[PDB]
Amino acid sequence: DMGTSYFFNPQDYKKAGYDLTKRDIFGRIPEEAYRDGTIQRQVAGFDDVLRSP
Amino acid sequence: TLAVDEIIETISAITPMAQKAKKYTPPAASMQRSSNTIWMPVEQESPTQEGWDLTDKATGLLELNVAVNMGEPDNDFFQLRADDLRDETAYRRRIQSAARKLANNVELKVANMAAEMGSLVITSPDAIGTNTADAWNFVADAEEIMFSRELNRDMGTSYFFNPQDYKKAGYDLTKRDIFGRIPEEAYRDGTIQRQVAGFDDVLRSPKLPVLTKSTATGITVSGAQSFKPVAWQLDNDGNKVNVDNRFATVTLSATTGMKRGDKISFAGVKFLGQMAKNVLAQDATFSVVRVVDGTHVEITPKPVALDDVSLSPEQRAYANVNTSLADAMAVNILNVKDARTNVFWADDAIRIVSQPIPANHELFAGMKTTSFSIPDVGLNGIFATQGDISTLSGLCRIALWYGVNATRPEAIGVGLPGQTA
Amino acid sequence: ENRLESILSRFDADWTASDEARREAKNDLFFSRVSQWDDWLSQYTTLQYRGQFDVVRPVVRKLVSEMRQNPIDVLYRPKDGARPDAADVLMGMYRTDMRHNTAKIAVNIAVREQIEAGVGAWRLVTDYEDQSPTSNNQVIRREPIHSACSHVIWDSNSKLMDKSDARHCTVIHSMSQNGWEDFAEKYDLDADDIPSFQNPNDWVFPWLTQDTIQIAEFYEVVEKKETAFIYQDPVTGEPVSYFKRDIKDVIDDLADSGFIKIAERQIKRRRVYKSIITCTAVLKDKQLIAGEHIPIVPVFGEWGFVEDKEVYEGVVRLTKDGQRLRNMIMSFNADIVARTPKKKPFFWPEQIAGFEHMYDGNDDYPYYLLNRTDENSGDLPTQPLAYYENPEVPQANAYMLEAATSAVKEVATLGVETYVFQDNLATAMRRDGEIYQSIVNDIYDVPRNVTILMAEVVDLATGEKQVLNDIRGRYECYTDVGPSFQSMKQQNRAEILELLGKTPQGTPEYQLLLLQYFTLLDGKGVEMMRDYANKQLIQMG
């Protein structure tokens, strides 16, 4: 109830963004992962997905 | 020993099935005498004839029924020593946990009965993550079997996934290499969609049962057995007593390795179109409810045969199966591997009867009894306290008297992925 | 550079600065509201008796009653050289939209917290009322703030009691799930994304559940020179209107109605912006609100700065020591009374062997029998009878219970009377009057009094919306403090009676009596009396 968090290391975050951007389509989420490095703030239901250096 | 009052919350349960289940509260004064049973009719089905001159071919009327009953209370009797500080500290939070666990018990019972008395069985030889859109194949197969059997779905329909298969469906959606509305929602949140393949409520349920593989091999039917739709029969005393329409006792060669909830199908026996009585292409599926004796079972859909010759025409008008049992036909199992069950039903298939416990009466002096609303589920119980000094203590009891009933076991279903081997 | 980071830097600075006083005020509220045994660090040892023997709650109740019998409200008065009735419309609107239950309750809550903890506050908000609007289909209402010490956080660099020079304030809102749903519905936020912020409450009392959804409202004030358009009134004179307030809505409708632009000046003014924030994101960025001031009014008790940090105190902070001592001593003495052996004789078993039913407390016997002889010693030793000594409260316990009670009695005397506290409430009311007047100028339709009548100059836009047109001759009335009336008719009645009390029985006394009958409420007999008084006044010229 207090929220759940996921933390990627920078390498896995780059790999996740690459997974989004190699997608042969650019609707909104691959476009965000392309122009910005971010995958998305919420993924697979987790209330907050960040990158931990 | 410094201590605080901030509680570390650790668990959080969700009970969707008990929410979707309609709750029935019949009159207690009559239920006391009726032996906690109440009977309901079943929508009438009529026969028909062809031709002009049909003398002596006039039929009668035959209206079937089912019975809904209830089990035993579900309590949280516990005892409170008046000097132990660790008992004084935790009492109210124990009451809260009692309410939560009672609700959990209710919805677990709902899930278990739905999984163990669901006649419709949708099996797959491979897991849901195997091919593309096979989760949609599951949900659409459930929709199609309901539509073809022409079951009533006016109140609604529901499909409960277990978390494993919910995630498998979400993976299927996000692997689509595109992002519109459905895949984007399935990516940002886990939710696949609220409606899938015609079902108007597709949810995930954390406590759906796992249906163990049956050990049965090479079981056959002993003797031809014709089952006749009847509304009552004479007993040994000449009194007419009613008949449940949702059970049939079948005498097999040997009922070893068969347990309650196993799913079977007889070779050659086929479904029917219910109203129109047109045979389908899918084998009829049954669920064994009780394994009585070592050569009898009780399967929850009654196999009334269309081609049966010993049925009166009004009885044949209730046929849901093309052919009867033939003294040799092979009953083949359908759950041949352990697998958690996805469960679908029409919303009017399961109900929850509930009764009161009148412990507030003037008979029970010394006790203080109050009402106690169970949250989440829509149920009421009693909360009774009685102090003691034979042990210098006090006894607290939260009781709840209900009973789940599958009024239409043929409208409930079970989805069994990975039924290979 | 990040807006959220700058806002959060301000918030953390102010939070840290107010840390001490906020915690002390929360402790004072807990002491005077929940329980005086703030012993939230418990132990699993056998339970010990802990009674509560209050000698500070009667004093708090007396002080709150004393302040309640003396209501105080805002009173607008014309400036020096202004028209004699410059404050009529503003005072009428103030009495119209501050006569409800919400305003009185908010002020009462703030006063009670001012007495107990040391600081309270209330808020002014504007709403669209389409049934009974004060003006321009809008109302101004006063809302309460509970636990102002922990929930209202001011600019740390404010050295004024009323915080007029505070340039940003952050208010923390805490709710449950339903309250959060309603907040999101009301502010057009997303109800799926549950917010979070710095929790201002502690789970010190066993409460089963406590609200855990938090959000913040960050108000900031920016003072700049913005454009004002000099026009020419089609009736008479020349008005001034701010460019922002008619930027696009009626910027041409003024000319089309017949206003001709004359000049364009640059006038300095303050604008207030509100942002809705959580601990991770900014929900609403800089939504501009009404008024030139932050809409929160604080009330203080004993307020000061010790060394670059604020201290506010009530009446309870200095009695906690003595009250805790009195509770502890009375608990110890209760323990003495309960768990102590009573006064009974000391016997050897052989002295009363065979007669132990003579000493169990019945009255069937005329005397008590004993034993004298033993078969080994011949005769029992004869010692004077001894009894367990009676329980007694030690002189130390008695002396210190008396001393702690006397000390609490001596400390718990505000002033000699609540003159200083009522003066601080009057300061709060003057500040509230300032804020309300500014908000009125921003959103209400303020007519101008012409000496040729009461004229309104307004116009509609193409979208059917009406934009108020207010001249810059607005601050014509200032703020004083007077008694609290429910309407201008009540205030005029009070003024008439006040004049009547000091007027001797000459001709003005007759004048004021007829005036009082003129301003009376309506039945049938009072209707006849008022008709007679009106006729007499008319006929007397």
**Single-letter amino acid code for the residue at C64:** V
DSSP per-residue letters across C15-38: HHHHHHHHHHHHHHHHHHHT-S--
**Residues from chain B contacting residue A27 (CB–CB below 8 Å):** 178-180, 184
Tokens of C272: 């207030």
**Residues from chain C contacting residue B5 (CB–CB below 8 Å):** 40, 203-207
Which residues have a Cβ under 8 Å from the Cβ of C345 and sit 6 or more positions away? Answer: C359, C385, C386, C387
C503 touches chain A (CB under 8 A): no
Which residues have a Cβ under 8 Å from the Cβ of B9 and sit 6 or more positions away? Answer: A1
Q: How far apart are CA C198 and CA C242, in angstroms?
A: 39
The dihedrals phi and psi of B57, each to the nearest 5 degrees, come to: -105, 10
Nearest to B111 by CA among B158, B170, B168: B158
Residue recorded with tokens 């608990």: C331
Q: How far apart are CA C467 and CA B298, in angstroms?
A: 79
Residue recorded with tokens 């909360």: B383
- Are B208 and B412 in contact by the 8 Å Cβ rule? The answer is no
Look at A3 and C194 and tell me if their CB atoms are within 8 Å. Answer: yes
**DSSP-assigned letter for residue C357:** T
Residue C395's H or E segment, with its range, is: helix C395-411
- Are C208 and B96 in contact by the 8 Å Cβ rule? The answer is yes
Integer angstrom CA distances of residue C481 from B94, B259, B277, C420: 56, 86, 90, 14
Nearest to C63 by CA among C32, C36, C103: C32
- Are B115 and B84 in contact by the 8 Å Cβ rule? The answer is no
Kindly report the three-state secondary structure assignment for every residue of chain B: CCECCCCCCCCCCCCCHHHHCEEECCCHHHHHHCCCEEEEECCCCCCCCCCCCCCCCCCCCCCCEEEEECCCCCCCCEECCCCCHHHHHCHHHHHHHHHHHHHHHHHHHHHHHHHHCCCEEEECCCCCCCCCCHHHHHHHHHHHHHHHHCCCCCCCEEEEECHHHHHHHHHHHHCCCCCCCHHHHHHHCCCCCCCECCECCEEECCCCCEECCCCCCCEEECECCCCCCCCEEECCCCCEEECCCCCEEEEECCCCCCCCCCEEEECCCECCCCCCCCCCCCECCEEEEECCCCCEEEECCCCCECCCCCCCHHHHCCCCECCCCCECCEEEECCCCCEECEEEEECCCEEEEEECCCCCCCCCCCCEEEEEEECCCCEEEEEEEEEECCCCEEEEEEECEEEEEECCCCCEEEEECCCCC
| Beta strand extents in C377-453 (DSSP E only) | 378-379, 448-449
Question: Which class for B51: exposed (0-12), middle (13-18), buried (19 or more C-beta within 10 A)?
Answer: exposed
**DSSP-assigned letter for residue C113:** H
How many residues would you count in chain A? 53
Integer angstrom CA distances of residue C153 from B231, C61, C202, C292, C307: 76, 28, 17, 19, 19
- Are B313 and B61 in contact by the 8 Å Cβ rule? The answer is no
| Helical ranges in C45-156 per DSSP H | 57-68, 88-97, 101-116, 148-151
**Single-letter amino acid code for the residue at B377:** V
Kindly report the three-state secondary structure assignment for every residue of C114-141: HHHCCEEEEEEEEECCCCCCCECCEEEE
- Are B305 and B318 in contact by the 8 Å Cβ rule? The answer is no
Chain C residues 151-210 with CB within 8 Å of chain B: 203-208
Which residues have a Cβ under 8 Å from the Cβ of B86 and sit 6 or more positions away? Answer: C44
B418 has which bridge partners?
none
Q: For chain C, list the contacting chains (3+ Cβ pairs, <8 Å).
A: A, B
- Are B359 and B344 in contact by the 8 Å Cβ rule? The answer is no
Nearest to B228 by CA among B35, B62, B407: B62
DSSP per-residue letters across C442-487: HHS---EE----EE--EEE-TTS-EEE---S----EEEEEE---SS
Residue C488: CB atoms within 10 Å: 15
Q: How far apart are CA C384 and CA C398, in angstroms?
A: 33
B232 has which bridge partners?
B242
Integer angstrom CA distances of residue C74 from A12, C93, C102, C475: 63, 12, 16, 15
- Are C69 and B32 in contact by the 8 Å Cβ rule? The answer is no
Nearest to C110 by CA among C63, C139, C143, C155: C143
Question: Which class for B179: exposed (0-12), middle (13-18), buried (19 or more C-beta within 10 A)?
Answer: buried
Cα Rg of chain A, angstroms? 11
The residue of chain A with its CA nearest to that of C193 is A47
- Are C115 and C67 in contact by the 8 Å Cβ rule? The answer is yes
Nearest to C264 by CA among C292, C226, C234, C235: C226
Q: How far apart are CA B218 and CA B207, in angstroms?
A: 33
The residue of chain A with its CA nearest to that of B176 is A23
Q: Which of B85, B88, B92 sits opposite C208 (nearest CB)?
A: B92
**Residues from chain A contacting residue B170 (CB–CB below 8 Å):** 44
A2 touches chain C (CB under 8 A): yes
Q: How far apart are CA C326 and CA C322, in angstroms?
A: 6
**DSSP-assigned letter for residue C244:** G
Q: How far apart are CA B378 and CA B352, in angstroms?
A: 10
CA–centroid distance for B161 within its chain: 15
End-to-end Cα separation, chain A, in angstroms: 27
Residue recorded with tokens 């307020």: C303
Integer angstrom CA distances of residue C412 from C322, C404, C406, C423: 10, 12, 10, 19
Tokens of C376: 């080994």
Q: For chain A, list the contacting chains (3+ Cβ pairs, <8 Å).
A: B, C
Q: How far apart are CA B128 and CA B168, in angstroms?
A: 6
* 3-state class (DSSP) for residue A43: strand
Helix, strand, coil tally for chain C in percent (to 5)? 35, 20, 45
**DSSP-assigned letter for residue C222:** E
Q: How far apart are CA C107 and CA C214, in angstroms?
A: 25
Beta strands B157-161 and B202-204 are parallel
The residue of chain A with its CA nearest to that of B183 is A29
Which residues have a Cβ under 8 Å from the Cβ of C423 and sit 6 or more positions away? Answer: none
Can you say whether residue B376 is alpha, beta or left, with left for phi > 0 and alpha for psi between -120 and 50 degrees? left
Question: Which class for B157: exposed (0-12), middle (13-18), buried (19 or more C-beta within 10 A)?
Answer: buried
Q: How far apart are CA C476 and CA C79, in angstroms?
A: 6
A1 touches chain C (CB under 8 A): yes
B241 touches chain C (CB under 8 A): no
| Beta strand extents in C231-354 (DSSP E only) | 240-242, 263-277, 282-289, 296-300, 302-305, 310-313
Q: How far apart are CA B2 and CA C42, in angstroms?
A: 6
B344 has which bridge partners?
B159, B413
Question: Which class for C293: exposed (0-12), middle (13-18), buried (19 or more C-beta within 10 A)?
Answer: buried
CA–centroid distance for B189 within its chain: 30
Q: How far apart are CA B299 and CA B261, in angstroms?
A: 9
Among 3.40.190.10, 1.10.10.10, 3.10.20.30, 2.40.30.240, what is the CATH number of B211-339+408-416? 2.40.30.240
